[PDB]
Amino acid sequence: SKAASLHWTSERAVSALLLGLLPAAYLYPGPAVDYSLAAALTLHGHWGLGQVITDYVHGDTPIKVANTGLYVLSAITFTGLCYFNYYDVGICKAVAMLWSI
Amino acid sequence: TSRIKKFSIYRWDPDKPGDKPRMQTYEVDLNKCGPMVLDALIKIKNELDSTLTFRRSCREGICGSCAMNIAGGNTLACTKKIDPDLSKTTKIYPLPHMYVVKDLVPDLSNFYAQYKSIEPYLKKKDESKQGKEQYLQSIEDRQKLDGLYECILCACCSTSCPSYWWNGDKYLGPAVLMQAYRWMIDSRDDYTEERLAQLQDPFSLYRCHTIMNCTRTCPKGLNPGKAIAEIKKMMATYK
Amino acid sequence: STQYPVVDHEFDAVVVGAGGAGLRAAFGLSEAGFNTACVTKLFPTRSHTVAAQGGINAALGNMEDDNWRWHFYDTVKGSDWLGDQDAIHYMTEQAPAAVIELENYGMPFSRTEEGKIYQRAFGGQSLQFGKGGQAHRCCCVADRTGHSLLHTLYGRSLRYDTSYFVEYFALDLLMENGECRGVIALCIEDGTIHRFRAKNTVIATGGYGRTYFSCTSAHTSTGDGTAMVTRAGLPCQDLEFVQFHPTGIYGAGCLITEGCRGEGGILINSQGERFMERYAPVAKDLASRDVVSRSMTIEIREGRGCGPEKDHVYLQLHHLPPQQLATRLPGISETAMIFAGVDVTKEPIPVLPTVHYNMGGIPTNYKGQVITHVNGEDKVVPGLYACGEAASASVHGANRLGANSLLDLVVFGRACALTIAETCKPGEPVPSIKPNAGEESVANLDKLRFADGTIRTSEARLNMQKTMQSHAAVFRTGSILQEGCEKLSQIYRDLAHLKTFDRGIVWNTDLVETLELQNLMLCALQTIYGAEARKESRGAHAREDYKLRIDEFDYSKPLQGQQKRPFEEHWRKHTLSYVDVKSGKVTLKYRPVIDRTLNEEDCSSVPPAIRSY
Amino acid sequence: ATTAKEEMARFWEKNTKSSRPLSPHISIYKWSLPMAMSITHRGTGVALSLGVSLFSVAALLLPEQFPHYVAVVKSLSLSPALIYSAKFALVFPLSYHTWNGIRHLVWDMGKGFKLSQVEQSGVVVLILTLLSSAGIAAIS
Ligand SMILES: *Cc1cc2c(cc1C)nc1c(=O)[nH]c(=O)nc-1n2C[C@H](O)[C@H](O)[C@H](O)COP(=O)(O)OP(=O)(O)OC[C@H]1O[C@@H](n2cnc3c(N)ncnc32)[C@H](O)[C@@H]1O
Ligand SMILES: CCCCCCO[C@@H]1O[C@H](CO)[C@@H](O)[C@H](O)[C@H]1O
Ligand SMILES: CC1=C(C(=O)Nc2ccccc2)SCCO1
Ligand SMILES: O=C([O-])CC(=O)C(=O)O
Ligand code: SF4
Ligand code: F3S
Ligand code: FES
Ligand SMILES: [K+]
Ligand SMILES: [K+]
């Protein structure tokens, strides 16, 4: 019954989180932050592109198709980031290394 | 010593459908015309082309009839000063992204139906004593309606909202949502929760992305963007 | 015809007009169970009612103690005894109930410290039958009362199954045997012709201020309903009584509410003098409109006008606290800035008397039923009603009191509905009309559509407006009225030479404005001929060649031993006007004013007396 | 009498099958900084998202690990000016989106809605974006 306002509320909460993870990534690099960013970046992004789809895509089929695709992209994205955090240096460290060039 | 001003106006005749929409230029001597764009429009129709068509009624910006797009912005022609720079041509178009009936006349029927859909009338849990005594309202509670009840339903704001352009079939739009807020906070209305429940879907209220074109274009100086933000806050906290 | 597609509708009732009156009558019929149609040339909230400012009168007693019989008295005197006391009685007594209804609909009235409806002072209203000082009974929504009243009534109408035909232009009544059986109209969106058949028709089309060159009126106040009555061969009444509002803004003509004076504003001339203290020692700037307008006009005539052309005067509000201006008069504060570049907290507004409202209209009884007058007797026209500015009940007589019109709309809009419901039953059979009924309306419409004469519509309309402005203004005289009459008669004959250009049918405003011109001209002819015949001064009609009000007795002296004047020898009577539409010949007749109230014992009749403020 | 829902349906049935044109919108509406910033906030968000997705997919598909490509780049001894420029281009969209995003969250708290505040906050967001971006491009 309140799914719409709940979603709107969730989106803001996640946006806030991301905001806090920025400073956190700088002050406390490491797994905790690395995985949180992986989750927040994926979720904030999924919902955002979701809003973009709702605005511009119309027609029942085109919309279902567009949303199935987005869901596929989000899954792959979250997987790749976790994989990178696991088998490689991790997001926080990758950024510092990239900035040392 | 005339001051010839040029106006380029959108034209389309339903009775000669095949002729594509075009712009027609008219030359008007400002020394023999009132100061507002509507004055020029009426002068053109009375002296230069009586086929030019537009809605109008009050001449003082209270009826809402003459809304149109002048120099890129939606506004009321009857209160819009003509730009006296004779080197510039003023372009006049119908309200944006609307179906044109003829010339500057848009079809506002979806707009009115959206307004009807939010039940813009006082509802109390028990209406059987209606007509017997004045309902009491404090000065402080009445003041909450300032900035909301003055809307003249011209549709300048809604037709300036990109979201209403792309989703006007399901997005109620700024004018309607602000009137919904106006009944939500009327201390005499007892259906606030229900008014809020009606917006629990992805489009009615939520296509608003705080672009703020609506508030910038209102000829009455109102702020529907702010009103929409207040609804979102109530939607997030109500029980 | 055969060339225009015709659509037929059957309803229990048809209301022409969606202003305050039309809407109130329309949903009033629907709430009583009648299958009702409301035909309007404009989307409802665009009607002139939306522009009303000052307020609506009712003896609620929210500010000080009141009595509706005092409001009855102020209205009778204000009308200069041309008003029918039975209708005035009904209107003032029903006023408190009517305002409470609107507030219970949600109208956002301004509030007092007790949470009740805020009421302001207004022109020509007193306590204690004119003996006790200024009344404060004008209920308002700051200075946008009309806007709120109309939007509130429109929202309410959304709760009923009334069928609305928006942007449909009514052309004529469907008459048969002296009975009205509906109306024929043009659907502006698609060009089709529609016939609305119904046992009862309510005309709520507004006034005709647009017959003048300068007016506070909308471009759409063209007397279309009054003209339909005239074309059906029925009489209109008291059309020569035209109200000039004291304060239309100089130039634009936009109304500056009388609420300004109700809240303390004052009129001053070029010498800074508060001149109403001289014309109306007691009432001052809150004297009746006919008196303030004439006083302002004399100030200007006598050289004390302001501006480079010394052609207007000033309305001063800056001595008032800016919080009061913002709370009570925010609307005109904006308007003054937009149309005169004036900041009301610092400088005065330039103003001048401006055509504003029509006291005359279609004659009705106090129940809203349209009447005709045959062999010295009033007779009801079966199935025809009228309310609002288009009707002459007559609650306003020779001069309407500010804030009594919005009251008039809801009270009589409601009365028409009540009367029909206590007279007929929903579902009764719909009256018949000949198969070609309305054909002459369609032929006239086709004639203007293809008119290829020599005088375009805007040219003839401007001629009409300038003639009226300069031959039937605040002060009038026999020879100027006569030249005006002949001028209008010629302009009327010259309509044979009309020229239009738009040959389309969808939204052909070139055509609709030519139809409105024919309507305006019929109203104007009657106004000016009636004025020329009325050789006396009464309320808004001032003759400099006939300066006294002429009653059946000389009420300035004792009646004891006086010889009553024969009906044909005095002027306290309503003018009934008729027009032979093909020729334009105007015929004038007279009917008596009704002095009896609805109950002598509860509200006694007010005999004529000297009228002074 | 017709319900709001029936009116909306007839509205679309009537117009979609009519010859009425749709009045211009995007090609004639006058722009404003707030409107431009609005499209830009959407543009940066999408760019940022496609960036994260591309990186995520590169991590799952590329042969070598991250340090390897970092070293390869360092070995090319590219001009520090060019590298500074690239750092600026990388942090710009994220900085813009971040500051403007905060501007949005303040609106969601119902603050800053007066036209003057809307214009002012937008200009502040542009300055903060340029300062932080220039500060970070020169490393942190
Ligand atoms: C002009 C004016 C009048 C006025 C006022 C301010 C201004 C600027 N302020 C007032 C106030 O504060 N208090 C008050 O008592 N009166 C005030 N007035 C006068 C008063 O407002 C008017 O007399 C009153 O509004 C009358 O309204 P009414 O219901 O009689 O009609 P209307 O609003 O003018 O609307 C007319 C309707 O009829 C329709 N129409 C007209 N012709 C046709 C045709 N041909 N076919 C179909 N419909 C027709 C119009 O569409 C409209 O809906
Ligand atoms: C190409 C991107 C630049 C942004 C366009 C700025 O556009 C300007 O914005 C200001 C402030 O809102 C308005 O007052 C002006 O009328 C408008 O032209
Ligand atoms: C619908 C919407 C945007 C939009 O489409 N803006 C826009 C598009 C085209 C032309 C002007 C503005 S930008 C902010 C998110 O919401
Ligand atoms: O006509 C009226 O009754 C009142 C009006 O114009 C005003 O607000 O001054
Ligand atoms: S909010 Fe302003 S722009 Fe929108 S309809 Fe109302 S008056 Fe017109
Ligand atoms: S322009 Fe549109 S997106 Fe929201 S703030 Fe105004 S309704
Ligand atoms: S004509 Fe009434 S708002 Fe312009
Ligand atoms: K409430
Ligand atoms: K009247």
| Full DSSP string of C315-377 | EE-TTS-HHHHHHH-HHHHHHHHHHH---TTTSPEEEEEEEEEES-BEEB-TTSEEEEEETTE
Phi, psi of B232 (to 5 degrees): -55, -40
DSSP per position, C29-74: HHHTT--EEEEESS-GGGSGGGG--S-EE----SSS---HHHHHHH
Phi, psi of A18 (to 5 degrees): -45, -45
Residues C365 and C468 occupy one common structural domain: no
Distance CA C439, CA C193 (A): 10
Measured from the CB, is residue C519 less than 6 Å from ligand 1?
no
> Does residue C593 sit in helix, strand or coil?
coil
* Nearest Cα residue to D101 out of A33, A43, A56, A12: A12
CA A7 to chain centre: 15
Helix/strand/coil percentages in chain A, nearest 5 = 85, 0, 15
Report how this structure was experimentally obtained.
X-ray
Residues D108 and D46 occupy one common structural domain: yes
CATH 1.10.1060.10 fits B108-239, yes or no: yes
SS (H, E, C) chain B: CCCEEEEEEEECCCCCCCCCCEEEEEEEEHHHCCCEHHHHHHHHHHHCCCCCCCCCCCCCCCCCCCEEEECCEEEEHHHCECCCCCCCCEEEECCCCCEEEECCEECCHHHHHHHHHCCCCCCCCCCCCCCCCCCCCCHHHHHCCCCCCCCCCCCCCHHHCHHHHHHCCCCCCHHHHHHHHHHHCCCCCCCHHHHHHCCCCCCCCCCCCCCCHHHHHCCCCCCHHHHHHHHHHHHHHCC
Q: How far is the CA of C206 from the centre of ligand 1 (A)?
A: 5
What lines the ligand 5 site, CB under 6 Å?
Answer: B 151-157, 174-175, 178, 218, 220, 222, 224
- The chain B residue lying nearest C499, using CA atoms, is B50
* Nearest Cα residue to B140 out of B183, B180, B185: B185
Query: H or E segment at C91?
Result: helix C85-104
Please state whether beta strands B90-93 and B67-70 pair in parallel, antiparallel, or not at all (unpaired).
antiparallel
Residues D36 and D26 occupy one common structural domain: no
Residues C185 and C276 occupy one common structural domain: no
In C155-299, at which residue ranges do the beta strands (DSSP E only) sit?
Answer: 163-166, 168-176, 179-187, 193-203, 236-237, 242-249, 266-268
| CATH code, D8 | 1.20.5.540
Distance CA D61, CA D44 (A): 25
User: Mutate which of D28, D29, D32 to test ligand 2's pocket (most atoms within 8 Å of Cβ)?
Assistant: D32
For C177, residues 6+ apart whose C-beta sits below 8 A from its C-beta are none
Query: H or E segment at A32?
Result: helix A31-56
Nearest CA owner, ligand 2 atom 17: D32
Instruction: Count the domains in chain D.
Output: 2
Structure tokens at B5: 């001003």
Residues D87 and D46 occupy one common structural domain: yes
Nearest CA owner, ligand 3 atom 10: D26
Length of chain A: 101
Give the C-alpha distances (Å, rounded to integers) separating C549 from A83, C234, C432, C542, C611.
102, 28, 47, 9, 10
Distance CA C52, CA C42 (A): 17
Residue C373: how many CB atoms within 10 A of its CB? 17
Q: Which of C46, C120, C144, C289 is catalytic?
A: C289
Give the C-alpha distances (Å, rounded to integers) separating C47 from B64, B180, C22.
10, 23, 10
Sign of CA dihedral D7, D13, D19, D24: positive
Structure tokens at D121: 């906050």
* B119: exposed, middle or buried (Cβ count in 10 Å: 0-12, 13-18, 19+): buried
Residues C211 and C129 occupy one common structural domain: yes
Measured from the CB, is residue B66 less than 6 Å from ligand 7?
yes
Residues D25 and D70 occupy one common structural domain: no
Residues D10 and D67 occupy one common structural domain: no
Q: What is the largest CA-CA distance in chain D?
A: 79
Expressed as residue numbers, the domain containing C376 is 1-248+353-431
Structure tokens at D98: 């971040």
For tokens 């939500």, what's the residue? B184
Among the three residues C516, C531, C548, which one is the final residue of a domain in this structure? C548
Distance CA D10, CA D99 (A): 45
Instruction: Count the domains in chain C.
Output: 4
* C504: exposed, middle or buried (Cβ count in 10 Å: 0-12, 13-18, 19+): middle
Residues D24 and D54 occupy one common structural domain: no
Locate all alpha helices (DSSP H) within C109-223, ordered by sequence: 145-157
| CATH code, A58 | 1.20.1300.10
Is B198 an interface residue toward A (CB < 8 Å)?
no
Cis peptide before B57 (omega within 30 of 0): no
Give the C-alpha distances (Å, rounded to integers) separating B213 from A64, B74, B197, D118.
30, 10, 26, 11
Is C35 an interface residue toward D (CB < 8 Å)?
no
Locate all alpha helices (DSSP H) within C233-280, ordered by sequence: 259-262, 276-279
Residues D25 and D50 occupy one common structural domain: no
Distance CA B174, CA B28 (A): 35
Q: How far is the CA of C522 from the centre of ligand 3 (A)?
A: 54
| CATH code, C481 | 1.20.58.100
| Angle (CA) B200 D100 D120, round 5° | 105
The partner residues of C172 in beta bridges, in order of sequence, read: C184
Residues of A in contact with D45 (CB under 8 A): 45, 48
State the Cα torsion B233-B234-B237-B238 to the nearest 10°. -170
Give the C-alpha distances (Å, rounded to integers) separating C59 from B133, C286, C494.
13, 18, 50
Radius of gyration of chain A (CA): 16
Please state whether beta strands C377-386 and C349-358 pair in parallel, antiparallel, or not at all (unpaired).
unpaired
DSSP tag of C269: -
HSE value, Cβ hemisphere, 13 Å, CA-based, for C265:
31
- Given strand C573-580, what is the order of strands in its sheet? C236-237, C573-580, C585-592
Distance CA B160, CA D29 (A): 8
Residues C78 and C15 occupy one common structural domain: yes
Distance CA D78, CA A96 (A): 18
Residues D48 and D26 occupy one common structural domain: no
Q: How far is the CA of C596 from the centre of ligand 4 (A)?
A: 28
> Does residue C153 sit in helix, strand or coil?
helix
Give the C-alpha distances (Å, rounded to integers) separating C44 from C49, C140, C155.
9, 21, 10
Phi, psi of B18 (to 5 degrees): -55, -30
Q: Contact B109/D7, CB-based, under 8 Å?
A: yes
Mutation target vs A (from D53, D62, D109; most A CBs, 10 A cutoff): D53
Distance CA B155, CA D8 (A): 16
| Out of D46, D53, D67, closest to residue A77 by CB | D53
Expressed as residue numbers, the domain containing D76 is 32-140
Topology given in CATH for the domain delimited by B1-107:
Ubiquitin-like (UB roll) (3.10.20)
Contact status, residue B197 vs residue B150, Cβ threshold 8 Å: no
Angle between helix A91-98 and A60-87 (nearest 10): 80
Distance CA C390, CA C392 (A): 7
Contact status, residue B51 vs residue C328, Cβ threshold 8 Å: no
Please state whether beta strands C6-16 and C193-203 pair in parallel, antiparallel, or not at all (unpaired).
parallel
Expressed as residue numbers, the domain containing A50 is 1-101
Residues C370 and C516 occupy one common structural domain: no
Q: Contact A8/B206, CB-based, under 8 Å?
A: yes
Please state whether beta strands C573-580 and C236-237 pair in parallel, antiparallel, or not at all (unpaired).
antiparallel
Q: How far is the CA of B184 from the centre of ligand 8 (A)?
A: 5
Structure tokens at B25: 């230029």
Instruction: Count the domains in chain A.
Output: 1
* Nearest Cα residue to D91 out of D46, D138, D36: D138
Distance CA C555, CA D97 (A): 84
Distance CA B182, CA B191 (A): 12
Interface of D with A in 38-97 (CB under 8 A): 42, 45-46, 48-49, 52-53, 55-60, 65-67, 70, 73-74, 83, 87
The partner residues of C384 in beta bridges, in order of sequence, read: C201
Residue B4: how many CB atoms within 10 A of its CB? 10
> Does residue C171 sit in helix, strand or coil?
strand
Residues C459 and C599 occupy one common structural domain: no
Contact status, residue B227 vs residue B178, Cβ threshold 8 Å: yes
Contact status, residue B207 vs residue B167, Cβ threshold 8 Å: yes
Residues C208 and C231 occupy one common structural domain: yes
> Does residue D25 sit in helix, strand or coil?
coil
Residues C143 and C197 occupy one common structural domain: yes
SS (H, E, C) C390-431: HEECCCCCCCCCCCCHHHHHHHHHHHHHHHHHCCCCCCCCCC
- The chain B residue lying nearest C52, using CA atoms, is B62
Q: How far is the CA of C52 from the centre of ligand 4 (A)?
A: 7
Is B197 an interface residue toward A (CB < 8 Å)?
yes
* Nearest Cα residue to C90 out of C418, C390, C398: C418
> Does residue C123 sit in helix, strand or coil?
strand
Sign of CA dihedral D88, D94, D95, D96: positive
Among the three residues C548, C570, C590, which one is the final residue of a domain in this structure? C548
Contact status, residue C204 vs residue C49, Cβ threshold 8 Å: no
Locate all alpha helices (DSSP H) within D1-79, ordered by sequence: 4-16, 33-61, 66-75
Is A8 an interface residue toward B (CB < 8 Å)?
yes
Structure tokens at C366: 């106090």
Identity (one letter) of the amino acid at C30? S
Residues of A in contact with B166 (CB under 8 A): 55-56
The partner residues of C39 in beta bridges, in order of sequence, read: C16, C165
For tokens 């979720």, what's the residue? A43
Length of chain D: 140
Residues C344 and C366 occupy one common structural domain: no
Residues D14 and D40 occupy one common structural domain: no
Distance CA D120, CA B141 (A): 31
Domains in chain B: boundaries: 1-107, 108-239
Phi-psi region of C376 (alpha: psi -120 to 50; beta: other; left: phi over 0): left
> Would you call C24 a catalytic residue per the annotation?
no
Give the C-alpha distances (Å, rounded to integers) separating D108 from B213, B230, B232, C136, C344.
17, 9, 8, 45, 37
Distance CA C58, CA D101 (A): 54
| Angle (CA) B106 B111 B116, round 5° | 145
- The chain D residue lying nearest A94, using CA atoms, is D66
The partner residues of B6 in beta bridges, in order of sequence, read: B27
Structure tokens at A96: 């510092």
> Does residue D85 sit in helix, strand or coil?
helix
Residues C150 and C233 occupy one common structural domain: yes
Residues C425 and C387 occupy one common structural domain: yes
Contact status, residue A37 vs residue A25, Cβ threshold 8 Å: yes
Give the C-alpha distances (Å, rounded to integers) separating A100 from A21, C333, C603, D55.
21, 64, 98, 18
Measured from the CB, is residue C47 less than 6 Å from ligand 1?
yes
Residues C474 and C491 occupy one common structural domain: yes
